[PDB]
Amino acid sequence: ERPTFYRQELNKTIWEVPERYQNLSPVGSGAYGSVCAAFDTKTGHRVAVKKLSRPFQSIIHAKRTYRELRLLKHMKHENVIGLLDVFTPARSLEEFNDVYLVTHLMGADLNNLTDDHVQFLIYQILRGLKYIHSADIIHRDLKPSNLAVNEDCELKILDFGLARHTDDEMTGYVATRWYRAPEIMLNWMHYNQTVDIWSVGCIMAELLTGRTLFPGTDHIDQLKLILRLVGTPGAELLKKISSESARNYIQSLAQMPKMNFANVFIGANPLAVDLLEKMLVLDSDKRITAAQALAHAYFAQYHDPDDEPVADPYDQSFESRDLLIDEWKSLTYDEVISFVPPP
Numbered sequence: 001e002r003p004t005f006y007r008q009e010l011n012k013t014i015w016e017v018p019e020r021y022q023n024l025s026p027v028g029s030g031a032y033g034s035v036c037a038a039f040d041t042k043t044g045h046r047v048a049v050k051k052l053s054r055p056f057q058s059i060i061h062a063k064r065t066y067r068e069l070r071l072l073k074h075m076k077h078e079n080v081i082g083l084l085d086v087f088t089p090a091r092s093l094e095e096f097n098d099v100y101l102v103t104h105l106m107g108a109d110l111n112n113l114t115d116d117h118v119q120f121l122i123y124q125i126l127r128g129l130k131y132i133h134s135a136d137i138i139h140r141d142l143k144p145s146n147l148a149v150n151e152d153c154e155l156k157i158l159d160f161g162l163a164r165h166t167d168d169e170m171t172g173y174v175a176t177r178w179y180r181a182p183e184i185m186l187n188w189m190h191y192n193q194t195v196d197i198w199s200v201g202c203i204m205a206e207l208l209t210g211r212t213l214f215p216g217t218d219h220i221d222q223l224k225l226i227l228r229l230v231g232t233p234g235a236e237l238l239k240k241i242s243s244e245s246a247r248n249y250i251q252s253l254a255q256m257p258k259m260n261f262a263n264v265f266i267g268a269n270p271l272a273v274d275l276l277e278k279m280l281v282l283d284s285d286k287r288i289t290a291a292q293a294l295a296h297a298y299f300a301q302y303h304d305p306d307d308e309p310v311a312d313p314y315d316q317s318f319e320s321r322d323l324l325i326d327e328w329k330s331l332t333y334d335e336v337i338s339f340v341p342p343p
């Protein structure tokens, strides 16, 4: 049976939601969309409710809406954001126009530390990342503002199905670039899931020192900071930079050796230094993986190979499919009506 819906004026729009959701109030800066906090009377959770803005206005927007719903419906892991509910007030495909998504309300992020704290926080990021990567999903945007943390230090990874970041968003002295792997920052080559391990290394360093690792003022300044720490590329990696122009620019720089990480991260646990050296490798083929990193001695007090699960298979063949607006809309409607809530 369909629930009863009620209407309220929120975020310059009329919101129409099931009676179970009460005490709606706008929250956040708008970085993830148009979002309200609420109390869910069915589960007892404080929740975040997102109303999608013009979901089917173009082919690009319609496919992005379908992508967000597919990703959120798949993610079922303690250290990753999950979907509590999805709904529409429409009674048929013909009147379907708005989509609402519901998740747990998270109070703070990593921006808002003993060595034991660093162990637990990085362990949880890697546990969630092992799950994400087992489904052949690449996050691309791990950074402190995308990591929700509660009073008991428990952590969830955020940011799935939103618009790809623009060139302007990545320009200048901006946190949205400081965590990016060099091969994606400069479009050196076709990248893969190894980009996310670079980002984890940048996050871990910052928790240990209290300071951004590579706070570049622009793309080139940031590359210079990176190469000073990890060394200039050797002939093996240069061959793999398929961009002719990017390869030529790199060879204009004087060669530099990799620095001594024990003299950069002064006083840190030697096991933390060792792990950072294995994450912050310029050649992405040679970086440690999430599954390998969980078994590193730095995490000995938390690692349990019987409690680090992998994901069900995730079919993303739709990503290479060309459809019309109304076809993406119908696929999205089908995914709304088939949703089954978690236990």
Ligand SMILES: O=C(O)C1=CCCOc2ccccc21
Pocket (backbone or CB within 6 Å): 032, 033, 035, 048, 049, 050, 068, 072, 081, 101, 102, 103, 158, 159, 160, 161, 162
């Ligand atoms: O990455 C996302 O899609 C979300 C992040 C948290 C804030 O907005 C959301 C609301 C509902 C479901 C998901 C999200």
Ligand SMILES: [Cl-]
Pocket (backbone or CB within 6 Å): 003, 004, 018, 019, 020, 021
């Ligand atoms: Cl209800």
Ligand SMILES: [Cl-]
Pocket (backbone or CB within 6 Å): 088, 089, 090, 095, 096, 097, 098, 099
């Ligand atoms: Cl609707």
Ligand SMILES: [Cl-]
Pocket (backbone or CB within 6 Å): 111, 143, 144, 145, 146, 175
């Ligand atoms: Cl951030």
Ligand SMILES: [Cl-]
Pocket (backbone or CB within 6 Å): 140, 141, 163, 164, 165
């Ligand atoms: Cl992106």
Ligand SMILES: [Cl-]
Pocket (backbone or CB within 6 Å): 253, 254, 255
């Ligand atoms: Cl030189």
Ligand SMILES: [Cl-]
Pocket (backbone or CB within 6 Å): 313, 314, 315, 316
């Ligand atoms: Cl699937």
Ligand SMILES: [Mg+2]
Pocket (backbone or CB within 6 Å): 141, 159, 162, 165
């Ligand atoms: Mg993002």
